[PDB]
Design a protein around this ligand. Structure first.
Ligand SMILES: CCCCC[C@H](CC(=O)NO)C(=O)N[C@H](C(=O)N1CCC[C@H]1CO)C(C)C
Ligand SMILES: [Br-]
Ligand SMILES: [Zn+2]
Length: 182
């Protein structure tokens, strides 16, 4: 019986509860383990992910980014957050759209990424109930970005412009050698 409620305030925190890892760190390149059990301990991790996300001003956060090797994502675009546990992309749709992306694991780097406009995903929610969602726009983009993290893929991997990739990584102190093919 769940006893942990997910009721997280959106606040800057002096000391975020979970620690980010950044491009080059091998934790970002490890395909995430399935979540075995959706219990109250997992809900507290969810709370801490949301607190960490909000404090860093993100709209999504995947557990590998904070060194937790689990198929777990939290998303909140709104000015009730979405929790995806063991998600699967069922298919994509629409046209391929190129938009600017950033990542909390690659601070300061903004580059164009082409993705399908629309995504359908199946997942278990924070109460263990199976759900399915179809998304478009920024939500579809964030979902695909986060699912990338669960598979060890980072947005820089999808960037086609070598000049802009190298310049942006250079200006922010990251190594192009940390980039991987898709
Ligand atoms: C766009 C798809 C990426 C969404 C998720 C990321 C956070 C992250 O790294 N998740 O793994 C985010 O909030 N990124 C922000 C971001 O790039 N955004 C937010 C909406 C538009 C886009 C560029 O401004 C930056 C400001 C941290
Ligand atoms: Br590397
Ligand atoms: Zn990211």
């Amino acid at each position: 019986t769940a006893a942990v409620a997910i009721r997280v305030a959106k606040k800057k925190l002096a000391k975020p509860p979970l620690d980010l890892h950044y491009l080059g760190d091998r934790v970002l390149r490890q395909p995430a383990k399935r979540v075995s059990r959706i219990d109250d301990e997992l809900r507290q991790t969810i709370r801490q992910m949301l607190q960490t996300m909000y404090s860093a001003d993100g709209i999504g956060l995947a557990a590998p980014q904070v060194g937790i090797n689990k198929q777990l994502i939290v998303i909140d675009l709104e000015l009730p957050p979405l929790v995806l546990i063991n998600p699967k992309i069922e298919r994509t749709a629409g046209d391929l759209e190129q938009c600017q992306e950033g990542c909390l694991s690659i601070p300061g780097v903004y580059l164009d990424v082409e993705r399908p406009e629309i995504v359908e995903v199946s997942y278990k929610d924070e109460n263990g109930r199976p759900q399915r969602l179809v998304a478009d726009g920024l939500l579809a983009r964030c979902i695909q970005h986060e699912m990338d993290h669960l598979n060890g893929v980072l947005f820089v991997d999808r960037v086609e412009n070598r000049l802009e990739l190298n310049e942006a990584l250079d200006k922010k102190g990251f190594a192009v050698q940390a980039v991987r093919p898709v």
